[PDB]
Amino acid sequence: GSRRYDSRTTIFSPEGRLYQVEYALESISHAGTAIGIMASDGIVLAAERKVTSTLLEQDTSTEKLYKLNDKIAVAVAGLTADAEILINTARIHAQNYLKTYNEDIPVEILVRRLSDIKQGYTQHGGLRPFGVSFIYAGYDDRYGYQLYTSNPSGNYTGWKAISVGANTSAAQTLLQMDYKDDMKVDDAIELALKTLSKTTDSSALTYDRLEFATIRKGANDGEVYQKIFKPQEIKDILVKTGIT
Amino acid sequence: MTDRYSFSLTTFSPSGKLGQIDYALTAVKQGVTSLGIKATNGVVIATEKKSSSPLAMSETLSKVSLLTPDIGAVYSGMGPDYRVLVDKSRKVAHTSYKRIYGEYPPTKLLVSEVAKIMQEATQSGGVRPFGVSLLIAGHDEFNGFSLYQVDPSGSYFPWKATAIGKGSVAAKTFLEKRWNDELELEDAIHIALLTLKESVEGEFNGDTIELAIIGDENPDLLGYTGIPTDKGPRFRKLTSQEINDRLEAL
Amino acid sequence: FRNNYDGDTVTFSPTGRLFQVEYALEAIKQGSVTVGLRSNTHAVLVALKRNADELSSYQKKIIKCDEHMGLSLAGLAPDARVLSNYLRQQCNYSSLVFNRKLAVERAGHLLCDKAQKNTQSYGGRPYGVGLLIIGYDKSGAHLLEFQPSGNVTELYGTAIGARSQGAKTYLERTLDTFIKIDGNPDELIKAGVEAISQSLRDESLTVDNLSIAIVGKDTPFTIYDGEAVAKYI
Amino acid sequence: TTTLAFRFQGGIIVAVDSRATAGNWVASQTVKKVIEINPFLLGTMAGGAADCQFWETWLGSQCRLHELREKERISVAAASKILSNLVYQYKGAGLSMGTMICGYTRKEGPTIYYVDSDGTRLKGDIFCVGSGQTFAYGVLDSNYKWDLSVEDALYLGKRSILAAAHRDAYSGGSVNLYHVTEDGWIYHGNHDVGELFWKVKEEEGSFNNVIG
Amino acid sequence: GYDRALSIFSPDGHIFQVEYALEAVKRGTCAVGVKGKNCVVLGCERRSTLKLQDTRITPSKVSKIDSHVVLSFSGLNADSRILIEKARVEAQSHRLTLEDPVTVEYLTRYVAGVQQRYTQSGGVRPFGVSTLIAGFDPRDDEPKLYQTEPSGIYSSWSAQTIGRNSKTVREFLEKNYDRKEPPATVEECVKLTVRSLLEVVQTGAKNIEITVVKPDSDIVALSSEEINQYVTQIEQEKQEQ
Amino acid sequence: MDIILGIRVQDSVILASSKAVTRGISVLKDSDDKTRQLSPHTLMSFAGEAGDTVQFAEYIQANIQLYSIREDYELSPQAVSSFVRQELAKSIRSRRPYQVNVLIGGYDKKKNKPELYQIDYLGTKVELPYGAHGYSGFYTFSLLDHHYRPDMTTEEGLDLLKLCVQELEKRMPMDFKGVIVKIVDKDGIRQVDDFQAQ
Amino acid sequence: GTGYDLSNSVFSPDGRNFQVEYAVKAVENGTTSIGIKCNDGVVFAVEKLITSKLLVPQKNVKIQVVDRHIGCVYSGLIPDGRHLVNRGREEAASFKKLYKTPIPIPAFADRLGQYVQAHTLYNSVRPFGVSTIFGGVDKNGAHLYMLEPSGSYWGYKGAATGKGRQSAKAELEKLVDHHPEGLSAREAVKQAAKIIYLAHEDNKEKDFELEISWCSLSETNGLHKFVKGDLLQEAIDFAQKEIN
Amino acid sequence: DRGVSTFSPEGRLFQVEYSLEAIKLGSTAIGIATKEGVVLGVEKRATSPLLESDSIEKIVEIDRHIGCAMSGLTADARSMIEHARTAAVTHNLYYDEDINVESLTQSVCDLALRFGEGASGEERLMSRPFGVALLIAGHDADDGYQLFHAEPSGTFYRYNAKAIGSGSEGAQAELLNEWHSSLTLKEAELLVLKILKQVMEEKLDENNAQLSCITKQDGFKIYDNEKTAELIKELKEKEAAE
Ligand SMILES: *[C@@](C)(CO)[C@](*)(O)[C@H](CC(C)C)NC(=O)[C@H](CC[S@@](C)=O)NC(=O)[C@@H](NC(=O)CCCCC)C(C)C
């Protein structure tokens, strides 16, 4: 029968590793780098687009930075198609929580659930895992600004600063070097762009190659506001930091 | 009878590559060239009609398809996989949108639905990915004109202009030189015909070339008068006669 | 050669053989010998029982299915339990719905059909047991041989199990004699015990070793063990 | 039916009649309306005869399974809830049962739980259940003290069923008595109303409404 | 749909998928549990590879199953959540039907039963997780400590460790834990736990985390400074030689 | 029906619940606690159909307790009362609906405010200074309209309930065997031992 | 790169289904059976190998009936043939249930055809290890069919399969030429006995038993009926008379 | 690969035979049947001295009249015991009597071959056979004191005496010589202790070995550690005498 053609996607190696989860992580190590930095007054999300053309429309483009909630957002590393499948369930989950409790979903609860879905494809069903790593940037009235990461194994952790995709090893050391606990957001913007600029496999870091976002409390409003930077806005902030 | 293929046929290799997606993309490279160009007041999608026999009737086989009154699709790769995708894309536009909102889906959302169907073909038990790249051109009230490309993986990208299939590498170069943000629709059709000529080995006319636009509303193509808000389809497939006119002065 | 075509029952070999079925047949050849034989009035089963140690009991070989029908087993006992249970239900159905004692021939056709479905479908293995079915329905005494391939043969006498070729040659030579043993059950059991001992290469047949079953004209299917079989030793 | 169970100084007293009726027809005068679940657990029965018998026998099995599973005797609260929850699954289906589950466990001491087919489950010190509950309640409440002797408590239970057996048309037969202690239940006999009534009348001086 | 037998027997009699699930456990971060006269203490190590974690929000290894029972684990982190949730649901279910919180042995038996079930069901792989389950039975002051493994086997321990370098820390406890006279105080019991982790983890106040469970639902995890103090005292004992 | 009353004062929610359990012509119990604690600062009382009443309460209790363990956090009274509503709103359109009317009394530790929610078996929630289920409301609603002030102390709130219980005892046909009274404030849930003769 | 014969539904590079061709080998291995179509009916005959004196004569019946008018005989794996008939018996009953009229032979043939073809479409099923000769009398005359393991079937004047298919066909083709204006029902029965004896030369080491059945408009009222006693002895003697 | 339920050329099921090798790696378990009762003993075998030995449960009660001893992958036995108990209690509910030891064992063995990958016939949802052998001992009114050995093959033998696990081959040879029809219960208890002491790697005491019996009068009891210690003390004296 079909026994002959089964890859056995959900089995352990003699070493105790999950073959497919391992190879999926390798796939992600080739995807454009994404960075998240949590400050005292907000969070930054910076991402590097891959294989850009001059004819590629950036205005209508949104491949790495997605809005999950009115207060939670994600950076994506890996298969965009796989990520959109999960992003949609996450959006549904946040809405179910709101319809049940009349309160916005706490960031960790939303993360645990996605991470639980990914873990499923690891243990049963004989299907391939999702080739995706997420950075989660969010806010709730319990923990304030939060930053999480999740990979194909369904494992998630909490960070002050983190990177996913290509050159994470190099990117994490640069962050560990320049990050301090009492950081202002405008400083965290610079660190994110500087780190990307150093780990880039491209010649230079330009606006048409970047996706950029912030989550910040109202400078006058008193509540939480998301901002997905537009091409012209990134071009502005890239001149400020000293990259042009 | 008993389907024993409940497991994935597309899995990760030690290098990180998803074999079946990559091979599907290889099938798309062998396919005939198709392209799309976005002008300020419209979008144009074009391809070559590669006939299997001089006894076959090429009119009975459309490589360009209407998806909604305002959205059209073209492809490179395996014909049959495209045909069944077109059927499903037309249906999903109703079930997942029109039956809910009483209006047609915007270009980006129908593209999103198409991509989902192809992502499932990457992960579901007992299936292979689709062997096609699509180019979807369309209009909606709040976005205007847009052009998308959908890959076998289920990924989609917005383009000012692009080409897929055989001569895509050379055609993308040719488009880069010629495209600007101030192109009128008649200019865009002119480039479309010129770019497609570099790909076509044989006869170049309205019988061997398939070309359609997303432009102004066509009230004479609606079929009925009376409702002022209903103005008519923006998708229009050009006739063999209409193509030849622009080729006489080309 | 055999390497590739024995992976499952669903697969044919280049010569037309089903190796999984053939390997199941081998389990019967390892099983302890049992013998069936009939006249016009009575049918008899004689079975040799096997133990593990001299501290263990001898596993039972004969199963009753109804008052008029029964069988003996050679090979995997759990499979024989599954098959005898089924045949019991089929006998039960025939009595309740039609008020009719199931014909032995039809019992065979049903067992044949049940064995077949295992030999053609992916996943399931074949059965690993042979059966000798004796009965007394509306058309006299019957004896049937079941092979887990599906083949079911109606016979006057036969044997299955290890060394069973000895017993079968004895019956083939004594055919004209025992078929006339009508209205004398004892002298038919005597012929069965003489048959089974033609397959004894190892040990002597003892009081807790031998098992006998008889069905007939005025005899409901009954099993004899222990001190009951003492007179045939 | 009439059934009662009450808690006092020296444990639990359980008393039941023994009559089964099908309308006005007396089906039986010798019914066991007490189920011995284990040496430390009793069940009483009122309402549908089959409903009580079947499900309380089933309860006995559920309790035995708890013993094998947990290596410890089931608590009164838990036993009652097995029945309570089963009964609730069938709510609206027409099961008819008024039950009491009485026992002793080290954790709980003496405990009585009332469970009915409506899904009601109540812990208490005094319960009377069945068509003749009110007739028992009148005698029981008007003589109950915590500090009653085991002897007096046994009598009061017996006398309470008698009171009900007399007035209620659907109660009678005989009285079955039980006493539950630290050491478990003790059976205290089957007393036929045919002879008990006349003995109680003479010795106590009660029942003057009756010519005799 | 998918029912392929993943956990099967091999010629020598082993279930290799279960055997490999143990290897995943051997890769996980070390976890240790020791019981005193009137307490149980769970110690777990944090990885040092990445020193940029947010401890406020990062999942900790010690999880409360109920108000009186705690669970720590070694192995695949993602797998542990599945086991924890099932155990937490069964805890609330047990309070509902029995009208009494779970005994530590019961909760262990349930978790162990789930693990076993995933070793002889089609389409699933074993849990790459071993757990330490600790707590106090309702109204009981006797300390309880249990271990489970991917095979589904479970048993109680005076002291046990799981995960990487667990051979080393077990060797320590075998010559340092007296069954005759267990640790009398809570402070005396916590000291031994920190001592054992110092065998496998290099100087790290950040690296060692401790949780103390007392009778009648009294669970409290220790701060970094408190644990740091235990380390500070222990390291001064050596230099006296 | 049973008596189910609630009143939010300055810094606490007070719940008073009927003590009797009557089936047919017999009062089976006179000390019934018609409430469940959902969390350290949230308490729910209940009244309705015989079985449904306790089964629904205990089911809701198991879910809120499960949430607390998972999250190591206590849901606000607003969040708990939305969860309860949706379960009833679900159940009313099922095969056999829970016939249970409830009151949620909670103190929000985050907002530092007491909260009272009235929810009926249909899933009709509303936040109130004072609430009542069953026939009880026909007497107490107008009484409280008159006597209630929004800044009353917990001591004033208890006096105000006694005035409600005195009225129900005088005018209502059923002997409900007095009430069990509970206070929900910043320090959690406690029972007023003496109300029967306070 | 081979292994094309290991799985059922697989096409080999030259376009074949090797698993069906391996089933054909199981048929060729089996006992020889034939069918003669006559001027108003059909005659079926089959060889029965007598391995031992112990097999009860006239008892192990091979030829089967579907409905009341169809007869079936098969070479190869007997259990498979029995399974195919159980299907035919269900199939005919279903047809009679809906259309009142008993199933026409061409209609019944395709019912077997689609069913046997179905067992060449999936890797989870084994092809049928039988060739089936079958036919009968319907609304418009006699029909004779032969069904191969592939699902292929055609109408025949005479059909043969199994061990002695070569001898049989060689003798059947002589009948078609010697009797151009049809053969009678009586004649065909006698002639069927000869063919079976002549095909037994292929298996001449063992003793055998003859089994014959017929379906004829004039001799059997268009119903399937076995050949017994005096008619069978007449056919046996005729075959013996033409052997010396 | 290869199918789960698949015959070898020799005529045996691969999975069943490999499962038998897992049992040979199990701890020793011994049963002895006498006319005064059946005795069941096990080797605890604790992997570390820190392990609390009395939490090793390899002797289990099935009903008051039926007991069980396990050897092999003992986690696999839990659902077998659960089935056994439910079968026993269920039989008592339908028939108001005690289940026969023979019928109980048969019910346990009915599970053993219910493994495969969505097969023909009935329904068999289990990926592999059980990796554990059972000794089932008990008493009923019909056949008296009985000892059964139930295997993952689905077949069960009755034994006068039986040893299972790692020491089983050396133990069965010893049990062959020792057992006679007229043994007393105390002789059998001392006999179980004598063989376990021989086949074990560790020195046998009341901590690493467990005794149990089943009698008509008191039913199935598992001996406490203080009782077993005294029988070990008694065995030491008897061996020393001759
Ligand atoms: C008192 C007699 C008051 O009824 C007890 O409740 C008594 C309970 C014992 C456990 C027997 N009940 C009782 O006898 C039943 C009264 C029925 S009530 C609900 O009206 N009687 C029965 O259960 C009788 N059976 C039936 O009514 C079954 C009818 C089925 C019709 C298809 C028996 C004759 C006991």
The radius of gyration over CA of chain E amounts to: 18 Å
How much β-strand is present in the residues of chain E? 15-25%
Shape of chain E: globular
| Shape estimate of chain F | globular
CATH topology of chain E: Glutamine Phosphoribosylpyrophosphate, subunit 1, domain 1
User: What string gives the helices and strands of chain E in order?
Assistant: HEEEEHHEEEEHHEEH
Number of domains of chain F: 1
Major pleated sheet of chain E: 5 strands, antiparallel
Strand order in the sheet with the most strands of chain F: 10-1-2-11-12
The total of helices of chain E stands at 6
Q: How many helices of chain F does DSSP assign?
A: 4
CATH topology title of chain F: Glutamine Phosphoribosylpyrophosphate, subunit 1, domain 1
CATH architectural arrangement of chain F: 4-Layer Sandwich
Family (chain H): Belongs to the peptidase T1A family.
Subcellular location (chain H): Cytoplasm; Nucleus
Modified residues (Phosphoserine) (chain H): 48
Keywords (chain H): Cytoplasm, Nucleus, Phosphoprotein, Proteasome
Structural summary, described in words:
By secondary structure, chain D is an alpha+beta fold. Chain D has one domain: Aminohydrolase, N-terminal nucleophile (Ntn) domain (Glutamine Phosphoribosylpyrophosphate, subunit 1, domain 1, 4-Layer Sandwich), CATH 3.60.20. Chain D is 35% helix and 34% strand. Chain D has 5 helices and 12 strands. In chain D, the strands form 3 sheets. A 5-stranded antiparallel beta sheet of chain D has the order 10-1-2-11-12. In chain D, α3 packs antiparallel against α4 and α4 (150-167) packs across α5 (193-204). The two termini of chain D are 26 Å apart. Chain E contains 6 helices and 10 strands, in the order αββββααββββααββα. In chain E, the strands form 2 sheets. A 5-stranded antiparallel beta sheet of chain E has the order 8-1-2-9-10, covered by helices on one side. A 5-stranded antiparallel beta sheet of chain E has the order 3-4-5-6-7. Chain E is an alpha+beta fold. In chain E, α2 crosses α3. Chain E has one domain: 4-Layer Sandwich (Glutamine Phosphoribosylpyrophosphate, subunit 1, domain 1). In chain E, a hairpin with a 4-residue loop joins β1 and β2. The longest helix of chain E is centred in the middle third of the chain and has 21 residues, at 77-97. With 198 residues, chain F is an alpha+beta fold. Chain F has a single domain, classed as Aminohydrolase, N-terminal nucleophile (Ntn) domain (Glutamine Phosphoribosylpyrophosphate, subunit 1, domain 1, 4-Layer Sandwich). Chain H is an alpha+beta fold and 242 residues long. Chain H has a single domain (1-242), classed as 4-Layer Sandwich (Glutamine Phosphoribosylpyrophosphate, subunit 1, domain 1), CATH 3.60.20.10. Chains in contact: A-B, A-E, A-F, A-G, B-E, B-G, C-G, C-H, D-E, D-F, D-H, E-F, E-H. The interface between C and G is large, with 37 and 34 residues. The PDB classes it as hydrolase/hydrolase inhibitor. Keywords: inhibitor, carmaphycin, epoxyketone, HYDROLASE-HYDROLASE INHIBITOR complex. The entry is titled "Crystal structure of yeast 20S proteasome in complex with the natural product carmaphycin A".
